[PDB]
Design a protein around this ligand. Structure first.
Ligand SMILES: *[C@@H]1O[C@H](CO)[C@@H](O[C@@H]2O[C@H](CO)[C@@H](O[C@H]3O[C@H](CO[C@H]4O[C@H](CO[C@H]5O[C@H](CO)[C@@H](O)[C@H](O)[C@@H]5O)[C@@H](O)[C@H](O)[C@@H]4O)[C@@H](O)[C@H](O[C@H]4O[C@H](CO)[C@@H](O)[C@H](O)[C@@H]4O[C@H]4O[C@H](CO)[C@@H](O)[C@H](O)[C@@H]4O)[C@@H]3O)[C@H](O)[C@H]2NC(C)=O)[C@H](O)[C@H]1NC(C)=O
Ligand SMILES: *[C@@H]1O[C@H](CO)[C@@H](O[C@@H]2O[C@H](CO)[C@@H](O[C@H]3O[C@H](CO[C@H]4O[C@H](CO)[C@@H](O)[C@H](O)[C@@H]4O)[C@@H](O)[C@H](O[C@H]4O[C@H](CO)[C@@H](O)[C@H](O)[C@@H]4O[C@H]4O[C@H](CO)[C@@H](O)[C@H](O)[C@@H]4O)[C@@H]3O)[C@H](O)[C@H]2NC(C)=O)[C@H](O)[C@H]1NC(C)=O
Ligand SMILES: CC(=O)N[C@H]1[C@H](O[C@H]2[C@@H](O)[C@@H](CO)O[C@@H](O[C@H]3[C@H](O)[C@@H](O)[C@H](O)O[C@@H]3CO)[C@@H]2O)O[C@H](CO)[C@@H](O[C@@H]2O[C@H](CO[C@]3(C(=O)O)C[C@H](O)[C@@H](NC(C)=O)[C@H]([C@H](O)[C@H](O)CO)O3)[C@H](O)[C@H](O)[C@H]2O)[C@@H]1O
Ligand SMILES: CC(=O)N[C@H]1[C@H](O[C@H]2[C@@H](O)[C@@H](CO)O[C@@H](O[C@H]3[C@H](O)[C@@H](O)[C@H](O)O[C@@H]3CO)[C@@H]2O)O[C@H](CO)[C@@H](O[C@@H]2O[C@H](CO[C@]3(C(=O)O)C[C@H](O)[C@@H](NC(C)=O)[C@H]([C@H](O)[C@H](O)CO)O3)[C@H](O)[C@H](O)[C@H]2O)[C@@H]1O
Ligand SMILES: *[C@@H]1O[C@H](CO)[C@@H](O[C@@H]2O[C@H](CO)[C@@H](O[C@@H]3O[C@H](CO[C@H]4O[C@H](CO)[C@@H](O)[C@H](O)[C@@H]4O)[C@@H](O)[C@H](O[C@H]4O[C@H](CO)[C@@H](O)[C@H](O)[C@@H]4O)[C@@H]3O)[C@H](O)[C@H]2NC(C)=O)[C@H](O)[C@H]1NC(C)=O
Ligand SMILES: *[C@@H]1O[C@H](CO)[C@@H](O[C@@H]2O[C@H](CO)[C@@H](O[C@@H]3O[C@H](CO)[C@@H](O)[C@H](O[C@H]4O[C@H](CO)[C@@H](O)[C@H](O)[C@@H]4O)[C@@H]3O)[C@H](O)[C@H]2NC(C)=O)[C@H](O)[C@H]1NC(C)=O
Ligand SMILES: *[C@@H]1O[C@H](CO)[C@@H](O[C@@H]2O[C@H](CO)[C@@H](O[C@@H]3O[C@H](CO)[C@@H](O)[C@H](O[C@H]4O[C@H](CO)[C@@H](O)[C@H](O)[C@@H]4O)[C@@H]3O)[C@H](O)[C@H]2NC(C)=O)[C@H](O)[C@H]1NC(C)=O
Ligand SMILES: *[C@@H]1O[C@H](CO)[C@@H](O[C@@H]2O[C@H](CO)[C@@H](O[C@@H]3O[C@H](CO[C@H]4O[C@H](CO)[C@@H](O)[C@H](O)[C@@H]4O)[C@@H](O)[C@H](O)[C@@H]3O)[C@H](O)[C@H]2NC(C)=O)[C@H](O)[C@H]1NC(C)=O
Ligand SMILES: *[C@@H]1O[C@H](CO)[C@@H](O[C@@H]2O[C@H](CO)[C@@H](O)[C@H](O)[C@H]2NC(C)=O)[C@H](O)[C@H]1NC(C)=O
Ligand SMILES: *[C@@H]1O[C@H](CO)[C@@H](O)[C@H](O)[C@H]1NC(C)=O
Ligand SMILES: *[C@@H]1O[C@H](CO)[C@@H](O)[C@H](O)[C@H]1NC(C)=O
Ligand SMILES: *[C@@H]1O[C@H](CO)[C@@H](O)[C@H](O)[C@H]1NC(C)=O
Lengths: 172, 319, 319, 172, 319, 172
């Protein structure tokens, strides 16, 4: 992906997460956490549903057209009818092929984007209380029980509550 | 020991689908939806479009009134369906613009016929032939009037028929090409006839060619078929010294969503907006590989048989 | 404490327009421009294109030389405009492939006529008529020469006319169809005849067709119109027993940007590159929704009546 | 926003900034103020003008074409002439719809990029003398009078003369 | 120091190229590749398509059997190449639908001829002419049979020829239009009469028209050329009073990937799948600017003469 | 570019780098060196080769078509034959012009991506032992002989070994 998060600095996906597209796995004194992030999951889903509805909009309604199969040789006028329909099919076949290639390229890049946005969302919250271990994980430098972890996912993490405890462990 | 850890991630599945992109020809994502409709039940749904099953009658034969096509009189349709087992059973005939006449009648979408009394004078009417039997009884096209001589005389006919309705009129007529110089004089006493059909903007003149044609149902003659449209305010004008296959009236010629399709599929009782010769198909996908011949609200025909649109992220499992 | 705060942001507008994207159907940006011209003024501008208003005349009428169309002789045009109120007022006629003769004359762009002396011997020329009154008196199509008996005798005509110039020549001729057998003999003495017009490259044969018609504007008959292009080095060869409406010369066929259009829009003193039958439209936008019939440097016709292209960022107020 | 800055971590835009597309707001001892950033404003405007001129370029000039309206029923040749023009109109109508949708999607994403690029420029310039608050603003840990701000708005902020004052205010 | 410094960067090149993008229309990348083929060698490659150089012969002349086209008997092709130097050196002829015949023959892709004996009785066969010499000796089109009087009699002909084979037969026949009334009688004794060639689905009538045609190669006459396809289980049927240029047999109507092209390019021994009138072009690129006329696996024709696809990053050189 | 690295915070490229597309340049007391990064160079090449392969390929194999040049004025049917071919050529010329513009815009944007991705991959390796100088160069706050700069390019660089030395030199 252009944002190098999915199939990038995050080595692989979680087959064990089924209630969301992006989520948090954590670890602390009371081990065992996993939770999905609804806001980012919802964002990727809305866009994918949005484009999926644009492409199946369904406008073509044709009735009396030209004959497209012929049982007798008629020469010139029939050459043209075949050429017209042949030309039309090739152009729509090209449109269809290019449409899929563009949307799928964009779908990968936007889903990769949401993963990166969630990472930068979490990074800014933690301020100076954590560091990026490189594999999509943060090492949090202070005691953080399950309630403290939930406040990070709820967006209610108060950083200078722990700033002094965290900066100590970081630089000692 | 003051530790903690918080890992961010995304889901995967054990079974992804492959899709195309700008850069990779095949790459795995968590999910996709097909965009090309490639299948069909093989049967035409008879709704919401008014279907008319042609059986053994082509539209042209039902227009003229071939005896075995009388159940098609004054029928309407949104889509007429011609079957490959159709046959002709009346007088042998020929339409110089067969595709054109088939096209315009199919587009009009109805066979509502209306009798008009032309003032033919000094001729016999309702001519019949062995080639066009109704039982063992000789008869003819139901919409055409075969005029021939009465008491060794065929006066030059001249008729006026003005369009004073508010719709256009479609007249179907013909010219008889007898097989021998004697058939001509037996029927029309004159050696060679003539037929002029006019409106204020049309001149169709035919001189019949006398000569032997392929033997068909005991007949070596043939009938050329012609058509003429008369708009409101216009007049229909016919002069003939012989060989006229006269019209009996006009067809109401509408314009709308009506057309014609060649197919041998059966007609079930269901609902489907899109019709093809291979049968009705659903129209939720934007494209279809079934057939380039379609009628109604259909997907667009493309050469591809599968086009996967990704509806998820890249699927990245582990090992 | 010695603080400072530095905030980075973007502008917004209380205004906003909605645009379409790949992902959202309506999303608000700060600004957008319209890409579809949907309105016309209703009037055709007289520049830059040389318009020629046909008024009560059609191009074919002006071509042949209908007396009430005499003012179109040797006129040149970029776009000929035909009006619905036009009428014919000379001898009755019909043109097989009328649409074709109209097209090839319209794209030629001029009616510059050049006289030529055909050696017609033994035959009277300049045949006249009423129903073609050129002010009170009798005359004919200005570009056509009606040949008829000279002292009740009609020698068979056989004349040649080569092309020794560097351009193609267009010849317009006709064939007379009298409505009775007597009319045929009173004009050309002999009965039904033959007309044969040939080049080294083309071949045209018409057999006149004697018999009645809807009598128009007073006469029993009608004329068929034909054309023949003679390339440089080629030859025109006319041989007729009679019924020939001879040409008087050639039209110079050119190739260029000339065309024809049907419209009742008034012509105005203004300038506009694009002409539609609704009148002229601006062509600053890539697409237009006014009419699929266009002439000149025009936007491309599309089904949508509006397409807004975003020219600013997402607009996020500020309540 | 693919980059998550406009309608993302910047809560809303400034209706009061009429002299540019992107800019700085500041708070210090001498007071508050606001200045547009010319470089990123010019970048976005130039890209949007460039794509606008390609869309409006306009090469399409036709003269004698086929007939497209008919007063008489003719049949086969006329069926073909109508089918040709209908096919052409549907194909161009698709092109116009897809072009606007792609271009607009790219116009939203590139204006989002410029905002993010300006935020990274500013972060790199401040080095260790500032912290990301997560909303588009920076906590500047030292005294920064108007000339110091005017020096950040512009590529000439020497972090080394404020580093010692800033690093002590950050760690205590 | 006790300090190190690590710089990241990207490569650059001295030459570089300009490409166009969505935003800029000239921006410099490190490397690009051409997407529009704009040049040809000037030579057609005779592999892998059977190429058949017509030299001085048109496909129609070879079909009829012009003597200098003798080397093309029963020949087949994938692409027939007509040269601008081709001439006709046989009896003057004319084809009403010349483009249609040329098309359907070219698409069929062979002249494989099958003899048939038709059983003409009472007439002389194998008529020849001073205008169609095979060796300074008079002769005729190798695939046509000129029927004329026998001891100054010409009985009216009636002939059948059933299609009991499994494919479609193509018959090429003609009608003779003599230059003078006296030439008509010296050949066919009777005055002009009809030719009626029919099947169960086709119907054709030609009326000979005596008249002075342009003198060509010694004669002022002209032959009209017509074609007829006979389906399997159908029957060809000729009835003619005279003036008939009879067929000697039938051609096979294949249906394949063969066509015809107008070019003067020489033919080399090379290999390329795409052919244009300007010669063969490579198909390694998706578009081409050589000619809109193509045959084979070809790039698609476009109006641009160059479209550079970026194959590297933006080129930012040093100072 | 949308990622702001090529023609962005990298002021220019290196004509002197010929063994790769993206790479490194360093300076110790040991002297200066240069080395390309195979992973990012390969990632960009494989995408461009991939899109190049999508673009240049069959099928457009046509055989018997309509006539496209005419020695004679014919009128109605010839107007239609010309109009059909003129319509087809305009549509493909448009498709070709648009394809190149999209591909080149994306080619430029994905190469900018891989440059930015290599930079962030490196920033995560160095943790708190280096500072972003803002121009594409890092400042490593500990003596690093050719062995460890080769362990950064390599991905074997362990930051816990130099964290004590680096944090001291950063903080005075
Ligand atoms: C110009 O030249 C053309 C042709 O060269 C002439 O046209 C020809 O005219 C004759 C006379 O009318 C006509 O002859 C009979 O044709 C049909 C054909 O029937 C089936 O046969 C064909 C052909 O296959 C046959 O092939 C071999 C050899 O050729 C035969 O030995 C086989 O038996 C095959 O049949 C086939 O395609 C189909 O299967 C056809 O259905 C035939 O029906 C007629 O025969 C009747 O002849 C008598 C008439 O009374 C009678 O005795 C017979 O019994 C039969 O019909 C009777 O049967 C009924 C009971 O079922 C009775 O109730 C009824 O009353 C009737 O008497 C035709 O006579 C040729 O087909 C025809 N050819 C063509 C190509 O058109 C033309 O006349 C010439 N011009 C002039 C001015 O003369
Ligand atoms: C209706 O109107 C048309 C139009 O006028 C008319 O058609 C005309 O018919 C005549 C008679 O056939 C024809 O006459 C000449 O045509 C040839 C033109 O040839 C060119 O080449 C010559 C050399 O390059 C050059 O000198 C010519 O000036 C011309 O440029 C020409 O070949 C013919 O030649 C023969 O003329 C007489 C015939 O008796 C002899 O004197 C000549 O030697 C020559 O051939 C004779 O000798 C050869 C030996 O090789 C011998 O084999 C042969 O039998 C012959 O006797 C003519 O001079 C016109 O060309 C033609 N006009 C056209 C086509 O526009 C119709 O005839 C008219 N209808 C009626 C019923 O009258
Ligand atoms: C050619 C002509 O004038 N035709 C007239 C026709 O004239 C013939 C008629 O007077 C008879 C009388 O029995 O005599 C013929 O001459 C004979 C005479 O005895 C002797 O001189 C000669 O030796 O022998 C001949 C034997 O035929 C005359 O030729 O009269 C009829 C009846 O009035 C005309 O029909 C009427 O025509 C009207 C329109 O006429 C014009 C016109 O204005 O259009 C006059 C034009 O001059 C004429 N053509 C030319 C080339 O000049 C045209 C043209 O003939 C017609 O339009 C063709 O349809 O007609 C009007 O239509 C009225 O309703 C008719 O009854 C006939 O035109
Ligand atoms: C049919 C024919 O060859 N006609 C010749 C014509 O011959 C007639 C002429 O001699 C008269 C007068 O005596 O007598 C006729 O025969 C009568 C017979 O004597 C009598 O017993 C019987 O009772 O009645 C018959 C009437 O049928 C002759 O038939 O002579 C003229 C003048 O010489 C010829 O015109 C010239 O033709 C030249 C060459 O023409 C060929 C050619 O090469 O094109 C010869 C071919 O053999 C011939 N085709 C066939 C199938 O026979 C063709 C063909 O007739 C024409 O091409 C058709 O247009 O002509 C020369 O090139 C030039 O064209 C003429 O000056 C006439 O053909
Ligand atoms: C084929 O079928 C058509 C069917 O319509 C028949 O044509 C109709 O009949 C005749 C033509 O033969 C047409 O009637 C003609 O009208 C002309 C118009 O004249 C006007 O002016 C006169 C004064 O001169 C007024 O009194 C009158 O009200 C008209 O409005 C006349 O020119 C014709 O009359 C001519 O002959 C008589 C007798 O000699 C003279 O007295 C006249 O002065 C003049 O010379 C004639 O009256 C009629 O309009 C045709 N119908 C249509 C719809 O056009 C054909 O007859 C028929 N052919 C056959 C059967 O062979
Ligand atoms: C093409 O142009 C030529 C050049 O004018 C033209 O040729 C001429 O045709 C006429 C008509 O056929 C010929 O005139 C004949 O001359 C002989 C003399 O031997 C007469 O005996 C003929 O009489 C016939 O017609 C009578 C009725 O009036 C019959 O009763 C009689 O039995 C004859 O059949 C007739 O007058 C003339 O010879 C030729 N040639 C020349 C040089 O004049 C030809 O008509 C044109 N073709 C067309 C118009 O289709
Ligand atoms: C289609 O094919 C058929 C089959 O060959 C063909 O039929 C033939 O037609 C001719 C002409 O119609 C017939 O010949 C005529 O026979 C009648 C008999 O009634 C005779 O009157 C005719 O001769 C003259 O007789 C008198 C002097 O003898 C004259 O006073 C009188 O005026 C006549 O002119 C003439 O010979 C022939 O019998 C038939 N043949 C058969 C087998 O039926 C027809 O011509 C073809 N039609 C085409 C090609 O258009
Ligand atoms: C520019 O000129 C164009 C052509 O003149 C205009 O296009 C026309 O736009 C009008 C909009 O008011 C359309 O409106 C009406 O359509 C129906 C026709 O329905 C059917 O009626 C009967 C059915 O029994 C039958 O005669 C036909 O089958 C009709 O289809 C009627 O209410 C009106 O008569 C009128 O036609 C026209 O249909 C439409 N015409 C064409 C040819 O497209 C255009 O609006 C003008 N202006 C602009 C800005 O584009
Ligand atoms: C058939 O022809 C006859 C004779 O020409 C027509 O009778 C006259 O027609 C004209 C115009 O059509 C009328 O003005 C006359 O009034 C008619 N005759 C009488 C005695 O009044 C007849 O009309 C033609 N046939 C038709 C159906 O109109
Ligand atoms: C988020 O978590 C905190 C602490 O666990 C809790 O107090 C708060 O109510 C939570 N809010 C929501 C919306 O879950
Ligand atoms: C005009 O044609 C006649 C034949 O109808 C001919 O005799 C005469 O010579 C020609 N005139 C001239 C000047 O050649
Ligand atoms: C990478 O290179 C360094 C020396 O420059 C070495 O220490 C390390 O082992 C190398 N990586 C591997 C996998 O051998």
């Amino acid at each position: 992906g252009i944002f190098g998060a999915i199939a990038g600095f995050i080595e692989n996906g979680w087959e064990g997460m089924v209630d969301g597209w992006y989520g948090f796995r954590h670890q602390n004194s009371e081990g065992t956490g996993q939770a999905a992030d609804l806001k980012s999951t919802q964002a990727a889903i809305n866009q994918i549903t949005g484009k999926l509805n644009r492409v199946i909009k369904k406008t073509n309604e044709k009735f009396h057209q030209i004959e497209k199969e012929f049982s007798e040789v008629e020469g010139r006028i029939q050459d043209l009818e075949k050429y017209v329909e042949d030309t039309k099919i090739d152009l729509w076949s090209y449109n269809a092929e290019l449409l899929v290639a563009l949307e799928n390229q964009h779908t990968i890049d936007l889903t990769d984007s949401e993963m990166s946005k969630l990472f930068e969302r979490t990074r800014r919250q933690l301020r100076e209380n954590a560091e990026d271990m490189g594999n999509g994980c943060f090492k949090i430098y202070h005691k953080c029980d399950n309630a403290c972890i939930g406040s990070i996912r709820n967006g209610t993490y108060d950083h200078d509550i722990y700033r002094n405890e965290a900066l100590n462990n970081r630089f000692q | 020991n003051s530790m903690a850890t918080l890992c961010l991630g995304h889901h995967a599945v054990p079974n992804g689908t492959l899709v195309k992109t700008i850069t990779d020809d095949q790459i795995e994502v968590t999910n996709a939806t097909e965009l090309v409709q490639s299948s069909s039940t093989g049967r035409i749904c008879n709704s919401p479009h008014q279907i008319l099953d042609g059986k053994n009658c082509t539209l042209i034969d039902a227009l003229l009134g071939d005896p075995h096509c009388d159940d098609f009189q004054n029928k309407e349709w949104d889509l007429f369906v011609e079957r490959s087992t159709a046959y002709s059973n009346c007088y042998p005939y020929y339409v110089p613009d067969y595709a054109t006449l088939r096209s315009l009648v199919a587009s009009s979408g109805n066979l509502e016929f209306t009798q008009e009394s032309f003032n033919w004078t000094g001729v016999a009417q309702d001519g019949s032939s062995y080639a066009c039997r109704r039982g063992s009884v000789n008869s003819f096209f139901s919409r055409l009037n075969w005029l021939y001589n009465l008491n060794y005389k065929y006066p030059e006919q001249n008729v006026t028929m003005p369009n004073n309705d508010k719709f256009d009129k479609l007249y179907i007529w013909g010219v008889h090409h007898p097989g021998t110089d004697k058939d001509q004089t037996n029927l029309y006493v004159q050696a060679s006839g003539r037929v002029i059909v006019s409106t204020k903007r049309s001149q169709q003149t035919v001189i019949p060619n006398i000569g032997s044609r392929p033997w068909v149902r005991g007949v070596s003659s043939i009938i050329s078929i012609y058509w003429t449209i008369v708009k409101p305010g216009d007049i229909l004008l016919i002069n003939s010294t012989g060989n006229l296959i006269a019209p009996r009236g006009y067809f109401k010629i509408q314009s709308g969503k009506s057309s014609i399709m060649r197919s041998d599929a059966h007609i079930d009782e269901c609902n489907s907006e899109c019709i093809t010769p291979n049968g009705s198909i659903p129209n939720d996908k934007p494209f279809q590989n079934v057939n380039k011949i379609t009628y109604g609200a259909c997907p667009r025909y493309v050469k591809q048989n599968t086009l996967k649109l990704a509806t998820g992220m890249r699927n990245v499992p582990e090992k």
